[PDB]
Design an enzyme around this catalytic site. Structure first.
Site, PDB file in Angstrom:
ATOM      1  CB  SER A  47    -102.909  -3.361 -37.578  1.00  0.00           C
ATOM      2  OG  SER A  47    -101.907  -2.450 -37.431  1.00  0.00           O
ATOM      3  CE  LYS A  50    -102.724  -0.182 -40.889  1.00  0.00           C
ATOM      4  NZ  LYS A  50    -102.397  -0.535 -39.517  1.00  0.00           N
ATOM      5  CB  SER A  95     -99.614  -3.463 -41.024  1.00  0.00           C
ATOM      6  OG  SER A  95    -100.371  -4.873 -41.163  1.00  0.00           O
ATOM      7  NE  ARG A 227     -98.969 -11.459 -35.351  1.00  0.00           N
ATOM      8  CZ  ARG A 227     -98.405 -10.315 -36.097  1.00  0.00           C
ATOM      9  NH1 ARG A 227     -99.403  -9.183 -35.796  1.00  0.00           N
ATOM     10  NH2 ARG A 227     -97.609  -9.960 -37.120  1.00  0.00           N
TER      11      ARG A 227
HETATM   12  C1  T7O Z   1     -98.056  -1.761 -32.524  1.00  0.00           C
HETATM   13  C2  T7O Z   1     -96.632  -1.226 -32.533  1.00  0.00           C
HETATM   14  O1  T7O Z   1     -95.873  -1.060 -31.874  1.00  0.00           O
HETATM   15  O2  T7O Z   1     -96.226  -1.017 -33.834  1.00  0.00           O
HETATM   16  C3  T7O Z   1     -94.762  -0.738 -34.144  1.00  0.00           C
HETATM   17  C4  T7O Z   1     -94.319  -1.858 -34.791  1.00  0.00           C
HETATM   18  C5  T7O Z   1     -93.224  -2.589 -34.164  1.00  0.00           C
HETATM   19  C6  T7O Z   1     -92.625  -3.742 -34.681  1.00  0.00           C
HETATM   20  C7  T7O Z   1     -93.387  -4.382 -35.977  1.00  0.00           C
HETATM   21  C8  T7O Z   1     -94.364  -3.629 -36.318  1.00  0.00           C
HETATM   22  C9  T7O Z   1     -95.027  -4.253 -37.710  1.00  0.00           C
HETATM   23  C10 T7O Z   1     -94.936  -3.377 -38.955  1.00  0.00           C
HETATM   24  C11 T7O Z   1     -95.493  -3.999 -39.873  1.00  0.00           C
HETATM   25  C12 T7O Z   1     -96.111  -5.207 -40.012  1.00  0.00           C
HETATM   26  C13 T7O Z   1     -96.182  -5.984 -38.781  1.00  0.00           C
HETATM   27  C14 T7O Z   1     -96.978  -7.385 -38.659  1.00  0.00           C
HETATM   28  O3  T7O Z   1     -96.847  -8.113 -37.623  1.00  0.00           O
HETATM   29  O4  T7O Z   1     -97.608  -7.707 -39.789  1.00  0.00           O
HETATM   30  C15 T7O Z   1     -95.823  -5.354 -37.418  1.00  0.00           C
HETATM   31  C16 T7O Z   1     -94.795  -2.665 -35.804  1.00  0.00           C
END
Ligand code: T7O
Ligand code: CL
Length: 242
Positions: A47, A50, A95, A227
């Site tokens: 992400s 983006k 995201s 992070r």
């Molecule tokens: C890469 C993947 O497995 O994507 C699937 C997934 C799984 C768990 C959490 C998130 C997610 C959603 C929104 C924001 C954030 C953030 O860290 O800002 C993280 C996405």
């Protein structure tokens, strides 16, 4: 030009993890990292992509402005904040992958590839599906390469309009108070090993800017808050933020 500060490794080992923080002092044109080798290892941007995707969609007119509404497609996904309408600001903030997948389809492979070359972005390789290559295709970027790209964005030097860069920098707004402003974007890459988390951006002070790019191993989603937390501990140790 680049100096290694292994004392920051403690901020990772404290949490039983591994990663790299890269900092760049813009006034002094000096860089700092805990791990020179990992700072130059390239990963899926996930992400963090983006940022370039937003820039390209705006400059080509796929996105009119930061208020244009991208309607939820009605398909229930497991991230609750994705099951709603978004604009560029909120799509960045949460995201929202499916919004940016539609951007990418409308940009198309030909325009996407030439803009990433124009940006000098990572390995400039979009092999894979046009609507998912930043999650499971061939594109790769290192922490030092993120810094290089972000510095151009900060200075409005990318090969898109000033307007496009100003809008994306607005959309990157993450935190602001009387002491500092952070403009940044998170990433979370899970589809190819190693699974990693990203945080890339910069800290604006009254009289200087500190660019940063970090990634870290992320075996589960439970560690995602590290992070920002680890980055901020480094910034605090270096007296960049209180
Ligand atoms: C890469 C993947 O497995 O994507 C699937 C997934 C799984 C768990 C959490 C998130 C997610 C959603 C929104 C924001 C954030 C953030 O860290 O800002 C993280 C996405
Ligand atoms: Cl702003």
């Amino acid at each position: 030009e680049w100096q290694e500060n292994k004392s920051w490794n403690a901020h990772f080992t404290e949490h039983k993890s591994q990663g790299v923080v890269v900092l760049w002092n813009e006034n002094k044109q000096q860089g700092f990292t805990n791990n020179l080798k990992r700072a130059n290892q390239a990963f899926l941007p996930a992400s963090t992509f983006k940022i370039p995707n937003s820039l390209i969609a705006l400059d080509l007119g796929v996105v009119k402005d930061e208020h244009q509404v991208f309607k939820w497609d009605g398909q229930t996904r497991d991230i609750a904040t994705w099951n709603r309408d978004h604009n560029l600001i909120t799509a960045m903030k949460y995201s929202v992958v499916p919004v940016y997948q539609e951007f990418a389809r409308q940009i198309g492979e030909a325009r996407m590839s030439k803009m990433l070359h124009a940006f000098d972005y990572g390995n400039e390789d979009i092999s894979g599906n046009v609507d998912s290559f930043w999650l499971d295709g061939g594109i790769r970027i290192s922490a030092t390469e993120q810094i290089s790209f972000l510095r151009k964005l900060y200075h409005n030097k990318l090969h898109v309009s000033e307007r496009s860069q100003r809008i994306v920098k607005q959309a990157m707004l993450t935190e602001a108070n009387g002491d500092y402003i952070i403009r940044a974007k998170t990433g979370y890459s899970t589809r190819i090993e190693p699974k990693i988390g990203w945080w890339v951006g910069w800290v604006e002070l009254d009289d200087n800017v500190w660019f940063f790019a970090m990634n870290m191993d992320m075996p589960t989603s439970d560690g995602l808050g590290l992070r920002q937390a680890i980055t901020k501990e480094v910034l605090k140790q270096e007296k960049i933020i209180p």
